[PDB]
Swiss-Prot record, chain A:
UniProt-recorded name of the protein: Insulin A chain
Coiled-coil regions listed: none
Species: Homo sapiens
Disulfide bonds: 6-11
Superkingdom of the source species: Eukaryota
Length: 21, 30
């Protein structure tokens, strides 16, 4: 999940938009 | 758009700034 993919690897703002309500 | 390393409070802040007042739910390590 994003606690690995954004932190240990790199993620985009477009990928963060998937995890909005 | 852009891409970065983002962790913890900075990840939760970036997610909140992408989503706005609509809210969110982050997924854990696995």
């Amino acid at each position: 999940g994003i606690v690995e993919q954004c932190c240990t690897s790199i993620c985009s703002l477009y990928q963060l938009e998937n995890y909005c309500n | 758009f852009v891409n970065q390393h983002l962790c913890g409070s900075h990840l939760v802040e970036a997610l909140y700034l992408v989503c706005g007042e609509r809210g969110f739910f982050y997924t854990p390590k696995t």
